[PDB]
C-alpha cells in the first residue's frame, strides 16, 4: 500500500526479485516484470500458484483460478491471467498511469555496482530513483561484507598491539583504514559486546595497532567480529532546495568581528541569506576556524557540528575548547571525545556524527568532508535535520569515499555524491581565503595543479620540501605493499640529515608503512586517514605509481599536511615534472 | 600545594593533615589479589599512587578516616565517573568525587574517596591466613583499633596460642559483627550491580573494613537488569575466617539483636 | 510476604484429623484424580479460614524485557487449590509478539501496581486499589 517508486501512483505491489521491495503500480509493475528477470511480485498475497506441490512463481504464467493463483497445470476450468493488458490485476487497476524512466530502474535493479557506469547512473538518475539506488547499493554492500573471520584476540602486547588472530580458513581482513570491528567478551555463560575499533597494520610482523571508542582496557579472549548493520528506507532527497533570502532570516548579526575569523566574516553574511552555503574548502585551511568563527558570529543561532566519523569531530572539539564555551555545547556519542553533554538535542552547539544524531531541527548545521559522504547519508541527514541554513564543508579535490565495490573505472570528484556534483557546476558559495596550514611551497603547486591557482601562497618558499627521483622496484603479496629498494633508499636518505627522524612515514598501503616502521622506525600515516593530522616534517614514498596512489587530489590532501617540509619519494614523472619542489637524486 | 588540599577537602569538615607530602604519592605495603594474564596470585605488594590524608577530629586527635586521592589517565576518569554515576544509590558504595587539578601546567584528573578505613579486608584475611608471631604488627593494630583488647594484652606470652591461653577465642569474638555487616553490604552491592547491568568481579582488597566499596575500573556495561557479578574468589578466600571469628552468633538471638534473649526453640 | 503456609496446613490436619485414613495433599496439583481433588479441596476450604486474607490471589514477579522493568503474574494462591506455578515463564526477552501483548494487557498486575491505594468504607468486601483520581 503506497505510491509506486516509478509513478507515484498508489499501488500495493513489490517486486519479489528486488531485495528492497519497491512499490510498483500495475502498469509500471508489468513493465518491470517484462523488462528484467523480475518474475517475482509480492502483494497482499504472494503471486505464487498456491496449489499442492506447485512451484511456479512468475506472474505471466499465473492465472486467477478461483480464489487461488494457479498455473495451467493446476488451474480449474475457469482462470484469469494476472500479468495481462500491460498492467497486472490488483489494487486500483484503473489509475496506473505508467512510467517513462523504466530501463534505468531495471538497470539499477540488476547492476552489480562493479563498473564505474553503475555509480555514474546512481549519481545521475532522478531523485527517488537515486534514493532507491543508494538504498540497494547500501544493502548489497552490507550483505557482501559478511564472509570474513573472527578476530580472536591473542597475545596482547602493550596497549597498542593486541597481535590479534584469525579463524584459519575464512578471514580476509582489510585491517587498513576505517574498517570497524566490534569486540565481544564472554562472561561465564553470557556474552556482551565491548565497542567498535578500527584496527591498523602496525609495526613488524603482527604488532597490529588498534584504535576506537569504549575507553576500557583490553583482555585476551575478547574476540572481534566485523560489524554489520541493516538498511532503513530513506525518505528525504539528497539536498534541500536552495533559496536566497533578502535578509538573515531567523538570525541576528554579530556585535563584534573577530580578527582570525574576519576573513571568514566576509563569508558569514551570505550563509544567512541563502538556504545552504557550498564551500570548496581547501585541505585543512582553517575549516574548523570557519566553523568556530560562525559560532561566535551567530551566538544566538543553534548550530550542529556533524560529520561522517567522530575523528572529524575531534578537530571540531579541539577548536571548541579553543574558543567555544563548554556550557552551550553538546557532544553526542552513541554506545571518542565526550567533553560536552552526550546525546542532548537541546543545545546551542551540537557535536555528533551521521550515525547517532536523531531527528531534530536547528538554525544552521555544518557538515564536513562532504567528499567523504555519500548521497545515501546525504539524504539521511536531510531526513534527520531541517535546519534553517545548511553548509557543506569539503572539496572533492581532497579524497573520495572508499567504494570497495567499485572495481571497474573511476568515479569523478563531482560524481562522489550530489553535493560534490554541484561543487563543479555551481561551485562554492564561500571560500577559505587565507591558507591556515601550508606555505608557498605546497600551496603554489597544489593551486596550479587542481585548485585553479585560487589558493594564495601563504608563507615563504620552504625549499626543504624535497622531491625525489626514482624509477621503481616494487613487490606485493596478498594485501600488503612492500618496497624494499624504496625502504633502503629512504633509510640512506634519512641518514643524510638526522633531523628527518621526526618526519612521519606516509604510505598508500599501511603495510608499506609497517615495513618502514620495522626498518625506518617512523610512524604510520594513511594517505586516506590524513586529514586533520599534520606535521611540519613528513616523509612519504609513493610505493606504487598507480591511479590509487598517483591521482592528483590524493597527493594534494597528502601534501597539504606538510607544514614546513615534505620528503616525497615518487616513482612517476607526471607529478615530478609538474612539481616545482626542490629536486634531489636517488640514494 | 595547599589549594590542592583545600580542593580535595570538599565539604565535609576541614580536619585534614597530609600523611603524604603535598603532591607526592605516599607509598605503602599492602596485601593484594590480582589476576591479569601476565601475573596471578594473592600476596603483599607496594601501593604507590595514593596521596593519603588522614582526617582528624576535634582537639586535633586522629581517627580512622582517610581521604585517599588518586591520579590516573583521562579515559579512566570519564569511565569511572560514568559508572559511579550509575550506581550512586546503594548504601554499599563509599562516597566518591571527581575533579581535575592544576599542580603545574597539566590538566591531570583526580579521584577522591572519602571516609575510608586504614586497612582493607584483604589485609585482615592475609593477616590470619599467613600468621607469623615474628611479624604480627598489622593484626595487633587492627585488634587495638576497634577496642578488641587493650595493648597490654600483648605482654602475656602465648596470647596468640590456642592451646595455651584459650581466652584468645574470646578476643576474636569481637570481630564477627563487622564481618557479618560486610557480608550484608556485599549482598546489597551485588544486587545493585545486577539491577543496573554491570559485569565484573570483586576482591577483598577493594572493600573497606566497614563494607563500603570503590575501584570500579574494570566494570563494563550491559542491558540493565542483566548484570552478572562473579564472587567465587571473594567468598572462597574469606571462608575460613567465619568460624574462626564466630560471625553468625547473632543469628541465635531473638531478632538478630545482640541485646536480646535467645530464640526459645521447641524441644 | 509469606505466601506458602503448607507446613501450617499439615500441622493443623495432623493435630485435629490424625486418624483419617487417606492421603491429603495440601497442594491439589499433586492429586491423582478428581476424587482426590474434591477430597483435598474440602480440607483446604476448612483450613484457609485462619490465614490472613491479604496473602491470596495472584503472584507477581518483576521481569526485564529489552532493559525495561515489568510486573507480570506467574501464579495464583487459591483459597482451596493451594499454590499453582506457571510452567513456561520468560524472564528476559527483546520484543513481544501479539499473544504475549494480549496476556500482559489482560493481567491485573500493572493496573493494580500503577494505581493508588484505596480504602472503601461503604462496602465490607476487600478493596484493592483505584485507577483514576475520582
Ligand atoms: Zn524489481
Ligand atoms: Zn507505477
Ligand atoms: Zn500450479
Ligand atoms: Zn489430593
Which CATH number characterizes residue A474's domain?
A: 3.40.50.300
CB A11 within 8 A of CB A92: yes
Indicate if A409 and A558 belong to the same structural domain. no
CB B241 within 8 A of CB B248: no
According to DSSP, the β-strands at B53-56 and B16-18 are antiparallel
Provide CB contacts within 8 A for B93, sequence distance 6+: B84, B87, B189, B192, B212, B213, B214
C52 touches chain B (CB under 8 A): no
Q: What separation in angstroms does the CA of A40 have from each of A47, A69, A108?
A: 7, 13, 17
- Is the Cβ pair B224, C92 closer than 8 Å? no
List for chain C the helix, strand, coil content (%; round to 5).
35, 20, 45
The ligand minimizing its distance to the Cα of A11 is 2
For residues A553 and A559, give the distance between their C-alpha atoms in angstroms, rounded to a whole number.
10
* Residue linked to cell 532522478: A126
Q: Is A435 annotated as a binding residue?
A: no
- Pull the grid cell for residue A405: 565495490
CB A364 within 8 A of CB A388: yes
Neighbours of chain A (3+ CB pairs under 8 A): B
DSSP lists the bridge partners of residue A331 as A351
Indicate if A562 and A461 belong to the same structural domain. yes
Element (H, E) at B5: helix B2-8
* Residue linked to cell 570481630: B175
CB B248 within 8 A of CB B152: no
- Is the Cβ pair B199, A192 closer than 8 Å? yes
Rg (CA), chain B: 20
Please, is A146 exposed, middle or buried when counting C-beta atoms within 10 Å of its C-beta (0-12, 13-18, 19+)? exposed
According to DSSP, the β-strands at A466-469 and A475-476 are unpaired
Ion ligand 1 nearby residues (CB, 5 A): A 15, 17-18, 38, 109
Indicate if A446 and A559 belong to the same structural domain. yes
For residues C6 and C48, give the distance between their C-alpha atoms in angstroms, rounded to a whole number.
11
Indicate if A323 and A400 belong to the same structural domain. yes
Indicate if A380 and A481 belong to the same structural domain. no
Q: Is A288 annotated as a binding residue?
A: yes
CB A180 within 8 A of CB A198: yes
- Pull the grid cell for residue A115: 563498473
Q: Which residues of B touch C92 (CB under 8 A)?
A: 225-226
Backbone angles phi, psi at B160, to 5 degrees: -85, -5
* 3-class SS of residue B198: strand
Indicate if A342 and A270 belong to the same structural domain. yes
For residues A468 and A587, give the distance between their C-alpha atoms in angstroms, rounded to a whole number.
9
For residues A119 and A415, give the distance between their C-alpha atoms in angstroms, rounded to a whole number.
8
Helical packing angle, A127-144 and A375-382, nearest 10°:
110
The ligand minimizing its distance to the Cα of A41 is 1
For residues B236 and B90, give the distance between their C-alpha atoms in angstroms, rounded to a whole number.
24
CB C92 within 8 A of CB A192: no
| Helices and strands in chain B: count of H runs, count of E runs | 7, 11
Indicate if A472 and A553 belong to the same structural domain. yes
Strands (E) in chain B, as ranges, are 16-18, 28-36, 39-47, 53-56, 62-66, 68-70, 96-101, 108-113, 198-201, 220-221, 229-230
Please, is C23 exposed, middle or buried when counting C-beta atoms within 10 Å of its C-beta (0-12, 13-18, 19+)? exposed
For residues B175 and B161, give the distance between their C-alpha atoms in angstroms, rounded to a whole number.
18
Which one of B220, B222, B229 would you mutate to disrupt binding with A, by most A Cβ within 10 Å of its Cβ? B220
Note which residues in 77-116 of chain C have CB less than 8 A from chain B. 92
A185 touches chain B (CB under 8 A): yes
Indicate if A497 and A553 belong to the same structural domain. yes
Backbone angles phi, psi at A12, to 5 degrees: -140, 15
Indicate if A417 and A450 belong to the same structural domain. no
Going from the Cα of A65 to the center of ligand 2, the distance in angstroms, rounded, reads 26
Q: What is the structure's resolution, reported in angstroms to one decimal? A: 3.4
DSSP 8-class letter at C53: G
| Helices and strands in chain A: count of H runs, count of E runs | 15, 25
Closest partner CB to B228 (pick from A190, A194, A220)? A190
Indicate if A404 and A451 belong to the same structural domain. no
Could you tell me the sign of the dihedral formed by the alpha carbons of A461, A464, A468, A474, in that order?
negative
Going from the Cα of C53 to the center of ligand 4, the distance in angstroms, rounded, reads 24
According to DSSP, the β-strands at A504-507 and A524-526 are parallel
For residues C66 and C80, give the distance between their C-alpha atoms in angstroms, rounded to a whole number.
37
Element (H, E) at B28: strand B28-36
Chain centroid offset of residue A401 CA:
4
* Residue linked to cell 493443623: C12
Compute, in degrees rounded to 10, the torsion defined by CA atoms C53, C57, C62, C63: 170
Q: What separation in angstroms does the CA of C122 have from each of A295, C118, C125, C133?
A: 67, 12, 9, 18
Could you tell me the sign of the dihedral formed by the alpha carbons of B116, B122, B125, B130, in that order?
negative
Indicate if A489 and A422 belong to the same structural domain. no
For residue A553, the enclosing domain spans 442-583
Phi-psi region of A70 (alpha: psi -120 to 50; beta: other; left: phi over 0): beta
For residues A71 and A379, give the distance between their C-alpha atoms in angstroms, rounded to a whole number.
43
Going from the Cα of A241 to the center of ligand 1, the distance in angstroms, rounded, reads 30
Going from the Cα of A18 to the center of ligand 1, the distance in angstroms, rounded, reads 4
For residues A568 and A83, give the distance between their C-alpha atoms in angstroms, rounded to a whole number.
64
For residues A132 and A106, give the distance between their C-alpha atoms in angstroms, rounded to a whole number.
12
Indicate if A335 and A452 belong to the same structural domain. no
Residue B148 exposure: Cα atoms within 13 Å on the Cβ side: 23
Amino acid at each position: 500500500v503506497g505510491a509506486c517508486v516509478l509513478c507515484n501512483s498508489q499501488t500495493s505491489l513489490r517486486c519479489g526479485a528486488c531485495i528492497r521491495r519497491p512499490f510498483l503500480c500495475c502498469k509500471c509493475c508489468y513493465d518491470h516484470v517484462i523488462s528484467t528477470s523480475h518474475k517475482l511480485v509480492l502483494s497482499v498475497n504472494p503471486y505464487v500458484c498456491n496449489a499442492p506441490g506447485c512451484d511456479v512463481t512468475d506472474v505471466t504464467q499465473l492465472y486467477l483460478g478461483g480464489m487461488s493463483y494457479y498455473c495451467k497445470s493446476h488451474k480449474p476450468p475457469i482462470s484469469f491471467p494476472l500479468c495481462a493488458n500491460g498492467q497486472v490485476f490488483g489494487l486500483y487497476k484503473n489509475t496506473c498511469v505508467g512510467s517513462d524512466n523504466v530501463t534505468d530502474f531495471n538497470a539499477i535493479a540488476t547492476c552489480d555496482w562493479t563498473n564505474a557506469g553503475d555509480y555514474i547512473l546512481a549519481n545521475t538518475c532522478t531523485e527517488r530513483l537515486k534514493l532507491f539506488a543508494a538504498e540497494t547499493l547500501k544493502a548489497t554492500e552490507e550483505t557482501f561484507k559478511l564472509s570474513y573471520g573472527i578476530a580472536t584476540v591473542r597475545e596482547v602486547l602493550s596497549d597498542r598491539e593486541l597481535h590479534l588472530s584469525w579463524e584459519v580458513g575464512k578471514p580476509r581482513p582489510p585491517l587498513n583504514r576505517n574498517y570497524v570491528f566490534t569486540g565481544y567478551r564472554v562472561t561465564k555463560n553470557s556474552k556482551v559486546q565491548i565497542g567498535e575499533y578500527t584496527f591498523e597494520k602496525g609495526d613488524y610482523g603482527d604488532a597490529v595497532v588498534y584504535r576506537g571508542t569504549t575507553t576500557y582496557k583490553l583482555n585476551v579472549g575478547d574476540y572481534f567480529v566485523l560489524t554489520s548493520h541493516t538498511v532503513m528506507p530513506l525518505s528525504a532527497p539528497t539536498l534541500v532546495p536552495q533559496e536566497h533570502y533578502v535578509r538573515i532570516t531567523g538570525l541576528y548579526p554579530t556585535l563584534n568581528i573577530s580578527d582570525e575569523f574576519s576573513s571568514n566574516v566576509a563569508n558569514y553574511q551570505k550563509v544567512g541569506m541563502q538556504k545552504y552555503s557550498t564551500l570548496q574548502g581547501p585541505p585543512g585551511t582553517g575549516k574548523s576556524h570557519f566553523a568556530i568563527g560562525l559560532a561566535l558570529y551567530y551566538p544566538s543561532a543553534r548550530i550542529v557540528y556533524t560529520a561522517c566519523s567522530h575523528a572529524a569531530v575531534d578537530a571540531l572539539c579541539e577548536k571548541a575548547l579553543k574558543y567555544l564555551p563548554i556550557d552551550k555545547c553538546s557532544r553526542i556519542i552513541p554506545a571518542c571525545f565526550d567533553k560536552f553533554k552526550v546525546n542532548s538535542t537541546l543545545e546551542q552547539y551540537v557535536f555528533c556524527t551521521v550515525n547517532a544524531l536523531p531527528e531534530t531541527t536547528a538554525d544552521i548545521v555544518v557538515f564536513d568532508e562532504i567528499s567523504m559522504a555519500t548521497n545515501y547519508d546525504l539524504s539521511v541527514v536531510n531526513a534527520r535535520l531541517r535546519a534553517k541554513h545548511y553548509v557543506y564543508i569539503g572539496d572533492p579535490a581532497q579524497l573520495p569515499a572508499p567504494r570497495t565495490l567499485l572495481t571497474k573505472g573511476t568515479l569523478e570528484p563531482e560524481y562522489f555524491n550530489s553535493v560534490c556534483r554541484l561543487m563543479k557546476t555551481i561551485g562554492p558559495d564561500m571560500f577559505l581565503g587565507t591558507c591556515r596550514r601550508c606555505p608557498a611551497e605546497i600551496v603554489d603547486t597544489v593551486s596550479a595543479l587542481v585548485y585553479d591557482n585560487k589558493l594564495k601562497a601563504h608563507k615563504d618558499k620552504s625549499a626543504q620540501c624535497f622531491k625525489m627521483f626514482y624509477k621503481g622496484v616494487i613487490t606485493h603479496d596478498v594485501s600488503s605493499a612492500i618496497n624494499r629498494p624504496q625502504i633502503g633508499v629512504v633509510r640512506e636518505f634519512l641518514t643524510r640529515n638526522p633531523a628527518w627522524r621526526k618526519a612521519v612515514f606516509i604510505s598508500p598501503y599501511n603495510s608499506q608503512n609497517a615495513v618502514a616502521s620495522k626498518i625506518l622506525g617512523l610512524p604510520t600515516q594513511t594517505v586516506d586517514s590524513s586529514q586533520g593530522s599534520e606535521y611540519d616534517y613528513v616523509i612519504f614514498t609513493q610505493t606504487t605509481e598507480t591511479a590509487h596512489s598517483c591521482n592528483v587530489n590524493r597527493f594534494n590532501v597528502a601534501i597539504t599536511r606538510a607544514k614546513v617540509g615534505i620528503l616525497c619519494i615518487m616513482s612517476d614523472r607526471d607529478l615530478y615534472d609538474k612539481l616545482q619542489f626542490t629536486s634531489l637524486e636517488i640514494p | 600545594a595547599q589549594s590542592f588540599l583545600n580542593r580535595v577537602c570538599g565539604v565535609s569538615a576541614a580536619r585534614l593533615t597530609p600523611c603524604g607530602t603535598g603532591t607526592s604519592t605516599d607509598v605503602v605495603y599492602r596485601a593484594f589479589d590480582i589476576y591479569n594474564d601476565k601475573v596471578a596470585g594473592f600476596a603483599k605488594f607496594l601501593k604507590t599512587n595514593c596521596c593519603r590524608f588522614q582526617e582528624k577530629d576535634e582537639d586535633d586527635n586522629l581517627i580512622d578516616s582517610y581521604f585517599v586521592v588518586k591520579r590516573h589517565t583521562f579515559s579512566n576518569y570519564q569511565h569511572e565517573e560514568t559508572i559511579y554515576n550509575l550506581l550512586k544509590d546503594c548504601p554499599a558504595v563509599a562516597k566518591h568525587d571527581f575533579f581535575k587539578f592544576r599542580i603545574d601546567g597539566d590538566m591531570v584528573p583526580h579521584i577522591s574517596r572519602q571516609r575510608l578505613t586504614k586497612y582493607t579486608m584483604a589485609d585482615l584475611v592475609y593477616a590470619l591466613r599467613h600468621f607469623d608471631e615474628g611479624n604480627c604488627d598489622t593484626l595487633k593494630e587492627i585488634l587495638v583499633t576497634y577496642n578488641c583488647c587493650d595493648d597490654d594484652y600483648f605482654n602475656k606470652k602465648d596470647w596468640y596460642d590456642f592451646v595455651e591461653n584459650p581466652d584468645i577465642l574470646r578476643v576474636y569474638a569481637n570481630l564477627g559483627e563487622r564481618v557479618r555487616q560486610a557480608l550484608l553490604k556485599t549482598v546489597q552491592f551485588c544486587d545493585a550491580m545486577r539491577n543496573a547491568g554491570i559485569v565484573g568481579v570483586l576482591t577483598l582488597d577493594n572493600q573497606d573494613l566497614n563494607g563500603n566499596w570503590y575501584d570500579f575500573g574494570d566494570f563494563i556495561q550491559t542491558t540493565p537488569g542483566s548484570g552478572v557479578p562473579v564472587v567465587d574468589s571473594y567468598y572462597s578466600l574469606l571462608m575460613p575466617i567465619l568460624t574462626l571469628t564466630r560471625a553468625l552468633t547473632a543469628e541465635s538471638h531473638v531478632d538478630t539483636d545482640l541485646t536480646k534473649p535467645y530464640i526459645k526453640w521447641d524441644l | 510476604l509469606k505466601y506458602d503456609f503448607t507446613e501450617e496446613r499439615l500441622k493443623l490436619f495432623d493435630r485435629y484429623f490424625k486418624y483419617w485414613d487417606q492421603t491429603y495433599h495440601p497442594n491439589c496439583v499433586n492429586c491423582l484424580d478428581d476424587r482426590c481433588i474434591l477430597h483435598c479441596a474440602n480440607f483446604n476450604v476448612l483450613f484457609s479460614t485462619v490465614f490472613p486474607p491479604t496473602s491470596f490471589g495472584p503472584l507477581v514477579r518483576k521481569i526485564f524485557v529489552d532493559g525495561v522493568p515489568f510486573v507480570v503474574s506467574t501464579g495464583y494462591h487459591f483459597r482451596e487449590l493451594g499454590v499453582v506455578h506457571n510452567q513456561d515463564v520468560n524472564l528476559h526477552s527483546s520484543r513481544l509478539s501479539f499473544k504475549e501483548l494480549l496476556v500482559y494487557a489482560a493481567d491485573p498486575a500493572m493496573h493494580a501496581a500503577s494505581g493508588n491505594l484505596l480504602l472503601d468504607k461503604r462496602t465490607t468486601c476487600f478493596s484493592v486499589a483505584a485507577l483514576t483520581n475520582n
